[PDB]
Amino acid sequence: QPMEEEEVETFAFQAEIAQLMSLIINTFYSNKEIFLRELISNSSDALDKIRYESLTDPSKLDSGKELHINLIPNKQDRTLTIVDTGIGMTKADLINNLGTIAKSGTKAFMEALQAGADISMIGQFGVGFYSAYLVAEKVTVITKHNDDEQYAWESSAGGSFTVRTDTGEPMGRGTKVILHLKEDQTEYLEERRIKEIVKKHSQFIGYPITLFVEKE
Ligand SMILES: Cc1cc(C)c2cc1C(=O)NCCCOc1cccc(c1)Sc1cc-2nc(N)n1
Ligand SMILES: [Mg+2]
């Protein structure tokens, strides 16, 4: 094929977010399973936004009426994907929410961690997404909002992330978090383990969750 050109935007994480990610990555914590509760909670919050917006404006559901969460483990590429049909993020929402803007709870949470707090407290500080780095070496976030095109955010930490127009499968609307799992965190690809953690932490979220299991 003739050589194609793709635009990429590399951003530096806000300093405190980068410090938080280094803490999460380089420190042992028990109870790493709470990452899934945090991502399902973000999906539920996003699904609430489209549900309520759609009450006044039904055309907001022209990108899909079904409000749900899908969990997709893939043992072949060692990824766990959390997909929702929530509001999604415009390019600006994506850059603003995933690393460039100082998060209100980062400073207090790092101090709490430095005082020996359990990593499970992360969600209360509004930085729950970053718990993905307890189990993932890289995270890819695909997002599609009704007012913009589909974007792909990615980071392997190291203080930077990239944003580009997504060349993968278009989604109608919502967000997909792809966790590229660490070699010692493959239990999160096992359906029994996923069911255990969803029953423990994510029973009352407000939307149906479907677990897709690859046939053996
Ligand atoms: C840090 C972060 C990462 C992701 C992938 C999502 C949300 C957040 C976060 O902490 N957001 C703060 C609350 C405002 O959140 C939103 C603002 C605009 C759009 C969205 C969420 S949709 C969304 C964002 C995040 N996760 C999901 N599944 N959906
Ligand atoms: Mg909620």
CA of 96 to the centre of ligand 1 (A): 10
Strand order in the sheet with 9-12: 9-12, 160-165, 151-155, 136-144, 174-181, 79-84, 69-74, 209-211
Domain limits for position 24 = 1-216
Which residue's CA is the closest to the ligand 1 atom numbered 14? 97
- Ligand 1, pocket residues at CB < 6 Å: 42-43, 46, 84, 86-89, 93, 97-98, 126, 129, 141, 175, 177
CATH number reported for the structural domain that contains residue 87 in this entry: 3.30.565.10
How was this structure determined? It was done by: X-ray
Burial of 170 (0-12, 13-18, 19+ CB in 10 A): exposed
Looking only at the bridges linking them, the beta strands covering 209-211 and 69-74 are parallel
Burial of 135 (0-12, 13-18, 19+ CB in 10 A): buried
CA of 44 to the centre of ligand 2 (A): 6
203/209 Cα distance (integer angstroms): 10
Helix pair angle (191-201, 34-56), 10° resolution: 60
129 appears as a binding residue in the annotation: yes
42 appears as a binding residue in the annotation: yes
CA of 38 to the centre of ligand 2 (A): 10
Could you tell me the resolution of this structure in angstroms?
1.4
2/17 Cα distance (integer angstroms): 40
Phi, psi of 115, deg, nearest 5? -95, 0
Cβ atoms of 67 and 52 within 8 Å: the answer is no
CA of 156 to the centre of ligand 1 (A): 18
80/39 Cα distance (integer angstroms): 11
48 appears as a binding residue in the annotation: no
DSSP SS3 for 90 = coil
What is the number of domains present in the chain?
1
